[PDB]
Design a protein around this ligand. Sequence first.
Ligand SMILES: CNC(=O)Cn1cnc2ccccc21
Length: 165
Amino acid sequence: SFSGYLKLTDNVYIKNADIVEEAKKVKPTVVVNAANVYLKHGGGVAGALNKATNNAMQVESDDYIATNGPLKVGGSCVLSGHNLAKHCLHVVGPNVNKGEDIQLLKSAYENFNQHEVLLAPLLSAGIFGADPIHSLRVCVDTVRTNVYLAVFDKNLYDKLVSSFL
Ligand SMILES: CNC(=O)Cn1cnc2ccccc21
C-alpha cells in the first residue's frame, strides 16, 4: 500500500513525491489526473502521466472526447489507468491562468468522493495557477474518501505541511 505519507486528517495524507513514480510503485486503484476539459495532456501532471503511458492515455482520451465532447470545469471522467493504475480519474479543476472560476475547485474535489481511495495531485495547483495552500484546504474540507496527495515540489510540500491548520 501507500508508504511514507504524513497524515493531515482522518482521510487526507500527503507526501513529497513524483505522482508518476508513486503510481508505478503502488499501482493504486485510482490515480487522479489534473486534466483540462479537452483531455489534452500537454504539461504539468497531465503531461507527465500521459508520457508515462507512452501516449496511450492521450489516444484513449481523444477517442473519449470524439464520442462525448469536452468535460465541464469541475467535472470528471473515469478512463483506464494504463501502466499507472487500474483507473485514471481525470478531474478538471479551474485554471485561474485561463480566467476560470476558483469557486469550481470544491466541485472538482467532489469527484474524489465517488472513489474509496485515490492517489492524487492538488487540484488547480501548479500550472493551473491556484494557490496550493487554498487547494489543500478545499481538499480536506471536501473529500471524505481516502486521498493520498503527491506534491512534486519539496519546497511547496514543506510550505503546505508547516502551514496546515
Ligand atoms: C516521470 N515523471 C515525470 O515526468 C515528472 N513530472 C513532470 N512534470 C510533473 C508534474 C508533477 C509531478 C511529476 C512531474
